[PDB]
Amino acid sequence: MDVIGERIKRIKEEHNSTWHYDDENPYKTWAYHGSYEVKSSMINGVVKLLTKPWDVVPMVTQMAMTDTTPFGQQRVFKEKVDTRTPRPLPGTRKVMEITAEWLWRTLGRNKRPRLCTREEFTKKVRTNAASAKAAVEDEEFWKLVDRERELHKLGKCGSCVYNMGSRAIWYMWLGVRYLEFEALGFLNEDHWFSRENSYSGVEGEGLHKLGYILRDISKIPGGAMYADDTAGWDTRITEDDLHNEEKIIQQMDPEHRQLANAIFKLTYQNKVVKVQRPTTVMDIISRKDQRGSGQVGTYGLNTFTNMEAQLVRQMEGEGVLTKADLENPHLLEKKITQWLETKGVERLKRMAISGDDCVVKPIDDRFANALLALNDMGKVRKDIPQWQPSKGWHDWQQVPFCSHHFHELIMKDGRKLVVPCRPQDELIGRARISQGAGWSLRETACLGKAYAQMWSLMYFHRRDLRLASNAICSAVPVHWVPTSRTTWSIHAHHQWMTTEDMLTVWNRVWIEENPWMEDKTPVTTWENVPYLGKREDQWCGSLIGLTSRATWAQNIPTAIQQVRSLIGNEEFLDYM
Ligand SMILES: O=C(N[C@@H](Cc1ccc(O)cc1)C(=O)O)c1cc(-c2ccccc2)c(=O)n2c1sc1ccc(OC3CCCCC3)cc12
Ligand SMILES: [Zn+2]
Ligand SMILES: [Zn+2]
Numbered sequence: 001m002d003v004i005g006e007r008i009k010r011i012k013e014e015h016n017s018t019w020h021y022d023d024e025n026p027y028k029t030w031a032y033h034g035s036y037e038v039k040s041s042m043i044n045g046v047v048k049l050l051t052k053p054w055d056v057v058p059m060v061t062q063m064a065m066t067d068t069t070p071f072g073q074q075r076v077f078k079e080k081v082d083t084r085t086p087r088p089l090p091g092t093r094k095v096m097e098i099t100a101e102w103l104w105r106t107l108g109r110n111k112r113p114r115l116c117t118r119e120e121f122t123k124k125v126r127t128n129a130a131s132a133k134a135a136v137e138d139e140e141f142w143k144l145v146d147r148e149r150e151l152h153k154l155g156k157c158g159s160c161v162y163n164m165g166s167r168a169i170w171y172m173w174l175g176v177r178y179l180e181f182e183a184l185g186f187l188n189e190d191h192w193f194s195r196e197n198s199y200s201g202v203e204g205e206g207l208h209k210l211g212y213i214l215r216d217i218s219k220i221p222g223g224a225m226y227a228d229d230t231a232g233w234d235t236r237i238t239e240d241d242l243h244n245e246e247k248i249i250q251q252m253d254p255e256h257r258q259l260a261n262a263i264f265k266l267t268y269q270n271k272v273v274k275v276q277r278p279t280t281v282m283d284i285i286s287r288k289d290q291r292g293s294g295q296v297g298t299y300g301l302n303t304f305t306n307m308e309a310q311l312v313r314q315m316e317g318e319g320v321l322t323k324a325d326l327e328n329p330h331l332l333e334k335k336i337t338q339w340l341e342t343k344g345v346e347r348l349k350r351m352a353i354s355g356d357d358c359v360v361k362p363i364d365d366r367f368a369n370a371l372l373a374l375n376d377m378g379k380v381r382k383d384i385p386q387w388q389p390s391k392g393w394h395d396w397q398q399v400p401f402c403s404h405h406f407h408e409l410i411m412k413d414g415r416k417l418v419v420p421c422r423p424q425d426e427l428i429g430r431a432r433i434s435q436g437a438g439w440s441l442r443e444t445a446c447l448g449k450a451y452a453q454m455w456s457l458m459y460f461h462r463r464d465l466r467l468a469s470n471a472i473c474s475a476v477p478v479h480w481v482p483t484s485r486t487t488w489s490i491h492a493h494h495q496w497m498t499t500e501d502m503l504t505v506w507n508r509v510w511i512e513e514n515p516w517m518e519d520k521t522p523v524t525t526w527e528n529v530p531y532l533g534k535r536e537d538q539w540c541g542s543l544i545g546l547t548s549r550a551t552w553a554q555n556i557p558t559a560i561q562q563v564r565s566l567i568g569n570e571e572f573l574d575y576m
Contacts, residue, residue, distance in 0.1 A: 003265070004286050006158050007272040008033050011284055014169075018281075026074075029082050030273075030285040037281050041066040044434040045441070046448040049559055050471045053548045054428050063429035070276040073164060077275070080232035085289065085378040090329040092312075092376045093240055095321060098333055099308045100244035102340045104251070106348075107192055107304075113252040115259070116185035118142060121178050135167070135174050145175045152179065152262035160267050162292045164275040180267070180296035183260040187248075187300035199348035200307050203299075207458060207491040208509055211406030211418040212516045213352050214359060214396045220350055223365040224392025225399050229382040233302065233356030234291035236378040241305050242269050242289070268292065299490060302355040306379075307348065310360055313374045314347050315339060317367035326372055352401060354490070359401050368392060402491055409461060409530045415519055417510060417530065419461050424541030427459060428468070435484060441567060443483065448472050450482035453496035457506060461532045463544050470575035471556050473502075475563035477570040503529075 001008070012019055015036035025032045041064060054060045067075065088096070122136050135141045144159075151158050160176035161169075187193070193201030195213065202213060218225065230236060246264040249257045272286050291298060315321045320339050325331050352359040360367070368389040375386055384390075393399045397406055403426075409417040431451040434444055452472035455465040482497050495505055503526055511517050523529055531537060534544065543549040557576060564572055 003157070003270045004272045006156055007161060008284065008286075010158060011036075011161065011272075011274075015282075022279075022281075025283060026078060027082065027283070027285055029084050030287050033272075033284040033286065035277075035281040035283045038276075039280065040064070042434045042437050042439070044432050044444055044448055046445050046475065046563055047432045047451065047472065049563055050448075050475065050556070051428055051432065051468055052559070053543055053546070053552050054425070054432070057425055057428075059423070059425035060429040060432060063426075063433060066433075070278045070280060073275065074277050077164070080235045081290070083235060085236050085238055088238065088240060088376050088378065089326045091321075091326040091331040092373055094331045094333070095312055095315070095326075095336060095373070096240060096244055096308060096377065098336050099311055099340065100247055100304075102337075102344060103304065103308055103311075104247050106344065107198060108248075108251045111190055111192060111197060113248065113256060113260075114186050114190070115256050116182050116189055118145075118178075120185070120189065121181050131170075132174055135171055138171075141171050141175065144171055145178055148175060148179060149259070152266070153258060155262065155265075157262065157266040162267070162271050162273045162294065164273060164294075176267070177296055179259070180263055183256070183263040184297035184300070187297055193300060193303045198303070198307070198353075199345055200310075200351040200353045201303055202352055202354050203303070203490070205491075206493045207402070207404070207420045207489070208514075210352070210402060210404070210491065211408075211420055214399055214401060214406060215408065215418055217350060217352060217359065217361050218396035220361050222350065222361045222363045223367060224394050225359055225361050225396055226367060226390050226392045227357075227359045227399050227401060228390050230356050230379045231382040233306075233379070234293050234298075236380065237289070237291045237302075237305065238378050239269070239289045241378075244308070245301050245304060267295070299355050303353055306353050306356060306358055307351070309374065309377055309379055310351055310353065310358055311340075311344070311347055312377065313370050314350075314360070314362055314367060316373045317362050317364070317370035319366070321373055323372055326376055354402055357402055359399055365392065402489070407461065407532055407536065409532065411523075411530050412528055413521070415517065415521075418516070420458055421461070421532070421540055424462055424464060424543075426541075427455070427462075427465065430486075431455075442480070445476045445563075445567060446480055446483040447486075449476045449480065450484065450486045450496060452476075453482060453498070453502060454486050456502040457496050457509060460506070460529055461537075462540070462542060463531055463537055464542050464549065466531075467553060467556070471560055474572065474575045475560040475567070476572075477567065478573045479571065 012034065018037040019034055021034055025035070043064060048055070125132050125136050148157070148159050159172040160179065161172065163173065188203070191197065191204050193203040195202055195205055202210060205213065242264070249260050249264070252260055269288055270286065271292055272284060273292070275283050275285060277283055291302070312321070315336070320335060350361045371387055380386060381390070397408065399405065404420045404422045407419050407421055409419055411417060431448070434447055449472060452469040455462070455469040459465045479499060481499055485494065486492070486496070495509055498505065503523070506529065507522055511520055511523060532540070537544060
């Protein structure tokens, strides 16, 4: 309470109207403080019309239901988030500590930690929105930020709360996120987890490059390629991991260390969380041993903790760590350090890690059964008995990573592409969703265009998607700019948010600026841009071959014209 008490007192005093201690609260692993009272999805008509066959598809239908109400916020909360991860064994705790140290040193070999700024935060906020904008322009916002910073320098914290008249707390939230960005932003802003700096990371590489990266790993001699899912990663982050993560502060300057120390000790290793629940109230809870997913640095810190954990699993697999070692309070460091120094970077290059998502090609398949450390650390795998060996892949094109798998294509001119793919229903289902309500047909059309153009660059190889994309582009006016973002994914670089010729953009991404494309001959026509094989298009969810799809394909200009006539008397272009 000596840390969180000051934040507890302010929310108490602010909402003392309806403040109380409800003894029928469902919080067993979280510490509960109090509560107070406070106040399906919409469909993209343009995309829907132009994808009629997928009206009668379960996965598309399922994606047309969002559970953003407080009913759903508690539904999945207690299952994973209200649980305790047992403390790792002394040996495991030492190994992690050594590895973390070694890893932090390796990452900061060239780069240097530094504070991010008001100007950077401002620049990002503006470009993103293209309400927080209003707060950034407000000078009194930044004055409040300074106030809290002085508290943070003093080791205290007053207003930094986390969420799972209104502008007051809205400023407090945004201000709290800036202070994080200030202290820990550099990890993201200076690209510490770029593949060049991290070896295993893929920050700033982009979806289009991920397939090429995995193919490169497959060339590395060793065992199979393992991509194990962790059950609720952010919930499995221990107190120990947080102690390992903060070791980064050792490379910071005094004034920067100072601020980062506060962020770690006061908002990560302790956290006062707001969570909404029907009875409609807001419960105030706190704990020390999990990740605040909405916070800044999360991706960076997950990537780090995962990199470490996999190196440790690799060590176990290689027979460096035994059961006895993990149990040992007085485990010797020599063999670990030796391993890290001689083989560490090599073993990092065998991995592609983005947050809790990982792919690993160990030197052999002992890794598959090396599960002592992995389970002991807390990173228990999803939907598989704790001690059952992992299922690896012998073809990199089967390996799942960042919600995708990847295909190697052969173009008509002999050159080879490597493209991202996933079930066609997931892509179409997502496209048919529009965000929120009160959207005009123009705004609805431009989102459809955004999605249509994303498919042109990333999923062009899917026959149905290319057809649907050309249909949407035909039905939507030419000079209308794609507005709202198609995804929040960190791997999306948003090359489709443009009114430039998509074949020109395609050429830029896949030929021109593609390090793996040696011959830079321009592809002059979409006829030269390849698809997957028919059978693999079908295996990944295509409806090519079905009558209904042939009907849809045959009757598509009629539907385009209907959308055109409802949009109005504008300038359209045909892409059929
Ligand atoms: O406030 C948020 N939601 C808004 C805004 C937003 C902004 C940025 C972002 O991406 C995602 C969402 C929305 O959904 O539109 C939000 C949500 C989430 C979130 C996502 C999945 C699960 C739980 C939380 C979220 O992750 N975030 C927000 S605002 C926000 C700001 C920065 C941020 O940094 C990332 C990248 C750099 C390293 C640290 C992590 C993350 C972040
Ligand atoms: Zn604070
Ligand atoms: Zn596929």
